[PDB]
């Protein structure tokens, strides 16, 4: 069972939905899912010594412009397991681009973490933290030449307004 | 697959049962199966710093009478994975209402730990070791507003045939 | 050396104290500095299954009226190890009696994380967050048998009003 | 679906094997895949206080000797979860008996990780490592009374032609 | 200022001595005091991949037989911090030779801790727990072809018998 | 007492010389020898989500061009804790500039970890982790404004000559 195509995007999208979690923050390791079969499975091993600051996944039964799911960014206190789904509120976006493509991601935060309660909009995260995120997107290929450019965070209506497009590009793909 | 549904209570039920955990010892974060697929799901997090003192999960093919698959919490040193299945020896139950639900978990230990050979019985444990796990489902959704009420334990005669009765449920039910 | 007599209480008091940290984030083993030696100590291990919520240590140079240093919280990212000297702006304190002692402990972040550049006051922590801290303090001795009772939290103001008296209370006693 | 007879052996065998790891490197926990529901379940904890030293798994659609899929030793820097599949080039074989029982075990290094790019044989391992392998595997049933027999160490030819037997005893038995 | 010099061996000898902790339980770094200045040093890296099954140190003011401070073992839930003082209670002693000396270790529990508080002699600890320390360090040295001897474990009488030995050992040799 | 002004440089210098640890591989904590009381003390949190990827710490007894004493790397397989000695020996050294000053730092293995026993020049290190280093101290400051400037590798004969005149600019500053 592929969770890719068997869950729905979200229980109340676009305001509340699942992630599906790939990499917990902390990772040096960057895993994926396997097409066929739906399993973990390892993409690479950062080139440099970073870890990724957030818990980071997909969205399932979406697809985006960089022919992907959509990639949604998960702010945990402590980390999950890979392959856990996590109800996720959207609260912004990062808006950037990966060697000519696409490949902005959602910024949320679990509904039942009550720390999180007010977090409602990208201004609500402290500054040097979207900095942090952004650096590492800038940076993490940097060893294998590849550039990024990190066009800069938009609100959560942009971020949910995307998170529609995407569904709807999965709807024409694959329905 | 839904390992719930699919597994059997156990090997040599009820003196050796299926645990399938959902939560490792030391997890603030508190996981439950999604019904409709099978995978790990984020239920909450705790609001309290506590932290799970058990290798805690749920027995297979069982059914309770607060409308779940019976609980179980096994003593693990090394705490394992979610949605690893363990070999448990029941050794005991603890008796507690969640918000006016029979909410009782069995306290077993794992067959192939040879640490735990001559853990039989809910007298074998250590006193403080049943207390902090008490104390932890008093307390773990106080800030939620919620109450619990914790009535003691049972011993491994009763734990086995709470078992037993969850077993008879589940056919029922299903 | 003991720390505690040998550092200034910090570099820019009451606006940004040293704290000396016994205790990272995640422990449930509580230290304590030896009088004697400065070493680290093992003062006992939480009855209960719960874990410091914050990094937590004292204030050098200060005494308090319950008899001990002042007590400080610096909330870290990553826990650092323990003896080790964080630079920390008081945020505010929280209020709480301990067996009948004024047991109170400022909250504080770390000024060299610019992840908490905007932590001035009281108002900028997530309440759930203030809740946690709250409630493990209410709760971690139950096992113990001890009562303690949470007054509720002072704001930055009042925190850098009773460092200045506990820098006060340890030139008079020493 | 039983991962150990849904995936392949691997995208280009045997220079590139899929490792399915059970016991990540650091774990005194021995797990194993429950050959019938294909989740993973505990098989025993260590009787003696060793870890496992590398990610420990098996090549899929593999049967080997002793009963069993064909066991992969994988050296990852920061070990992965269990059930991660990780794409694997074999650089030499462990030859060892347990119980009268033909046990060898592939040993082998992540292609995704760059800090392995010139291990490409048995003579790139330091020696003190592969000494460490052997030990743990000629001590960690011990306590059990089982008896392990360490032969020594094949190199990369020869963990390939092993792997392409054992690809073809899994054809004979179930295919 | 060398903790191995100024601290007394305990509040209430031989039931309560100090324990100072070198190595946490599960580190295969094998630490000592170092004996000018009493700052943490490396020893060296076990030759083989196990961890040290319980929290190890020395006993402040001994001196035995072998040469060194007097070993204890404290048996902690979680592991301290190198260089943290533990009060400890010896329930055993671990009766053992390397390399024709006498290399016995007192094995205690934390007395602050109940869950061990009706833990008062070698009786009380689980078998295959006092095989699995008696196995580490029988072991732990082969690959260095170091031969150690394991004679068998000790009751709690005799354990303080070897406190008090060694207190005196060390009054005569610096006193 | 403060480690930095006790300790001797090295028991064989410039052969083996101590390493004193600052920050333990993983940290993404910046520690520092307060150099008042030789306490730990947090220099400050990288803004970035990067961890160092070496045991980092000084050379007792050493003074630099750049008015600090001079830098150590260690390679460690299990990260030391704050403020171990480790009898080192240097393999090469990093040659980067810091703000206009002399930032150079020396890399080395740990004596007593036989993993490393053929390790003996800048040559034996995998081409990638001498990368991964070097990036991390390219980039590590960035969000600070802070600009640092590569210049490459040195070998082992050109770090002893460099530890030398470390500690001969120590004996001047302060003996
Ligand atoms: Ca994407
Ligand atoms: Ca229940
Ligand atoms: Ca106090
Ligand atoms: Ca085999
Ligand atoms: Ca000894
Ligand atoms: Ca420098």
């Given at each position: 069972?592929?969770?890719?195509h068997?869950?729905?995007?979200?229980?109340?999208?676009?305001?509340?939905?699942?992630?599906?979690?790939?990499?917990?923050?902390?990772?040096?390791?960057?895993?994926?899912?396997?097409?066929?079969?739906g399993?973990?499975?390892?993409?690479?091993?950062?080139?440099?010594?970073?870890?990724?600051?957030?818990?980071?996944?997909?969205?399932?039964?979406?697809?985006?412009?960089?022919?992907?799911?959509?990639?949604?960014?998960?702010?945990?206190?402590?980390?999950?397991?890979?392959?856990?789904?996590?109800?996720?509120?959207?609260?912004?976006?990062?808006?950037?681009?990966?060697?000519?493509?696409?490949?902005?991601?959602?910024?949320?935060?679990?509904?039942?973490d009550?720390?999180?309660?007010?977090?409602?909009?990208?201004?609500?995260?402290?500054?040097?933290?979207?900095?942090?995120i952004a650096?590492?997107?800038?940076?993490?290929?940097?060893?294998?030449?590849?550039?990024?450019?990190?066009?800069?965070?938009?609100?959560?209506?942009?971020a949910?307004?995307?998170?529609?497009?995407?569904?709807?590009?999965?709807?024409?793909?694959?329905?």
């Amino acid at each position: 069972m592929n969770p890719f195509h068997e869950l729905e995007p979200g229980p109340e999208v676009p305001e509340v939905v699942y992630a599906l979690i790939e990499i917990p923050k902390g990772s040096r390791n960057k895993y994926e899912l396997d097409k066929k079969t739906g399993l973990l499975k390892l993409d690479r091993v950062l080139y440099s010594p970073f870890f990724y600051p957030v818990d980071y996944g997909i969205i399932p039964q979406t697809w985006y412009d960089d022919g992907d799911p959509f990639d949604i960014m998960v702010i945990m206190r402590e980390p999950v397991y890979p392959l856990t789904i996590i109800e996720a509120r959207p609260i912004g976006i990062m808006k950037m681009e990966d060697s000519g493509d696409k490949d902005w991601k959602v910024l949320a935060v679990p509904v039942e973490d009550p720390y999180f309660n007010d977090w409602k909009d990208i201004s609500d995260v402290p500054k040097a933290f979207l900095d942090e995120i952004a650096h590492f997107f800038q940076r993490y290929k940097e060893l294998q030449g590849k550039t990024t450019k990190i066009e800069g965070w938009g609100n959560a209506e942009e971020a949910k307004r995307e998170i529609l497009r995407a569904i709807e590009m999965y709807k024409e793909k694959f329905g």
